[PDB]
């Protein structure tokens, strides 16, 4: 990874990889959902389909380019591939639709029949993908009245009131140079990149985003959604976590590693190390979970979710899993540290070393925002090394011993108690 | 064992009321909130307005009740005092 300030101010990143059949080309920016206000909630949404659209995507395929984008909380991207000898004419279409000329996009025939498109995903989604809705619920009550709140989305209410004025508003003061990074990945090398910009002059001003009021907070808090005409319940729950650039990033990414995921219906995952598999087999109290350690630039979330039919037994697969997070501060032993490091290295390596040139540039620009250049995967492996028993003792003695939680939860969630008798199984009344 | 007659409550999961949709909830653990603040508006004025509701209900038979034992007390004073004397031998015949 090569990263190189210009001489009018862009900043551009590298990632050459000879043995790969294609490139990629674009351009991430460092603001996302959490840049915006309750009112203009959804205007990334609609620039990411904008750029999608039918007229967009009919030029580009005429010249053998595909095009992709995605909407994040911290950044956004907007990246074109190709095959490795047409790089330059992915930049000339890049040129020609963000810098030279974006007037044509925003025509009132293309405007509102992308308005319609979107409404209809967002209704989609609201009704049918239960366990994305209750973890997009867990951060909007986990850091409610604060800007890390807002779906990336955007909700039915907002969508319906954006015109074109509020685009162009939402560009002006986001889509900047002083803002941006230029990525490459695949079968391209960085000098033909550099000097395939700087043949292009590109006066690019010198704008600067704006900066917020408010700072990100924690809230135990609960919100619940229930609806007995559903199969099912999906719960998620969660304490305040890690951000990105913390000193305990890859502690609190190994502790997820020792509890992990599961699935009631595969066979070789009943086999798994973990001690939590012992209680919940023997009644069946689950479908699937999960444990994840979610970072950002502020906060973080640190917890799991779970989907279950058995609706009469939540309150014990509650009891049981907060209960062998109790152990991580007490009593966690010598193998379930050193086989969480073992799978955290192999998890880690397929994220980072896949064959899409697309994933590798949106993980790419997006570190370049924050710390302005990229960890390497030999040095985040002795980081995972260098740590023992004690490290994992004196980080869930701060994060997880005798903390507030957040809880969201759909469908028949009936059985599941208040929240002080979920927040009481956080302390052992051993100790 | 064997199963018994029907109720009409049953416990965590299935406890007998109608379907819920459409309803949602919010709340704010106690650790977060700030200690003890319903201890002047909620003890003078919202007392109030619970007290004067519903003391007519109860003062109005308790002003009768206490009427009738007084001047029934007061009636036997007279009886056996030396001024109600022939009035102590008519009403025991």
Request: with cysteine.
């Amino acid at each position: 990874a090569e990263v190189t300030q210009l001489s009018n101010g862009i900043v551009v990143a590298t990632e050459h990889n000879p043995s790969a059949h294609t490139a990629s080309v674009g351009v991430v920016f460092g603001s996302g959902a959490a840049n915006e206000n309750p009112y203009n909630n959804g205007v990334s949404n609609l620039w990411k389909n904008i750029f999608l659209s039918k007229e967009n995507s009919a030029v580009a395929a005429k010249e053998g380019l595909a095009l992709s984008s995605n909407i994040s909380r911290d950044f956004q991207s907007y990246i074109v591939s190709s095959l490795p000898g047409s790089t330059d004419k992915s930049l000339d279409f890049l040129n020609q639709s963000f810098i030279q000329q974006k007037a044509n996009l925003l025509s009132s025939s293309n405007f509102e029949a992308t308005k319609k498109s979107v409404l209809k995903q967002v209704q989609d989604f609201e009704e049918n993908d239960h366990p994305n809705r209750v973890l997009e619920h867990l951060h909007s009550t986990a850091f409610q009245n604060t800007p890390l709140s807002l779906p990336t989305r955007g909700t039915l209410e907002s969508l319906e009131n954006l015109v074109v004025a509020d685009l162009e508003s939402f560009a002006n003061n986001h889509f900047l140079n002083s803002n941006a990074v230029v990525v490459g990945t695949g079968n391209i090398k960085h000098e033909d990149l550099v000097n395939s910009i700087e043949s292009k002059n590109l006066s690019l001003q010198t704008g600067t985003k704006p900066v917020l009021k408010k700072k990100a907070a924690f809230l135990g808090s609960e919100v619940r959604l229930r609806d007995d005409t559903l199969p099912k319940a999906w719960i998620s729950l969660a304490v305040e976590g890690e951000p990105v650039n913390s000193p305990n990033y890859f502690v609190a990414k190994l502790a997820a590693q020792i509890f992990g995921s599961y699935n009631a219906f595969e066979p070789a995952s009943r086999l798994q190390g973990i001690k939590l598999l012992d209680n919940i087999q023997e009644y069946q109290l689950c479908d699937n979970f999960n444990h994840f350690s979610l970072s950002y630039k502020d906060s973080g979330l640190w917890g799991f979710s779970t989907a279950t039919r058995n609706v009469t037994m939540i309150d014990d697969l509650i009891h049981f899993t907060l209960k062998q997070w109790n152990r991580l501060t007490i009593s966690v032993t010598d193998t379930e540290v050193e086989r969480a490091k073992s799978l955290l290295k192999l998890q880690l390596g397929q994220l980072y070393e896949s064959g899409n040139p697309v994933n590798d540039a949106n993980l790419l620009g997006a570190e370049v925002l924050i710390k302005g250049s990229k960890l390497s995967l030999g040095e985040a492996f002795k980081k995972i090394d260098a740590i023992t028993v004690k490290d994992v003792k004196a980080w869930a003695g701060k994060r997880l011993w005798d903390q507030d939680i957040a809880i969201a939860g759909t469908g028949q969630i009936e059985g599941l108690l208040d929240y002080m008798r979920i927040r009481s199984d956080m302390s052992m009344m051993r100790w | 064992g064997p199963p018994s007659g029907k109720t009409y409550m049953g416990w965590w999961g299935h406890m007998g009321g109608p379907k819920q949709k459409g309803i949602t909830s919010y709340a704010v653990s106690p650790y977060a909130q700030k200690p003890l603040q319903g201890i002047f508006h909620n003890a003078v004025f919202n007392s109030f307005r619970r007290f004067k509701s519903q003391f007519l209900y109860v003062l109005i038979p308790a002003g009768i009740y206490w009427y009738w034992w007084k001047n029934g007390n007061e009636y036997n004073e007279f009886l056996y005092s030396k001024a109600g004397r022939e009035e102590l031998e008519r009403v025991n015949v």
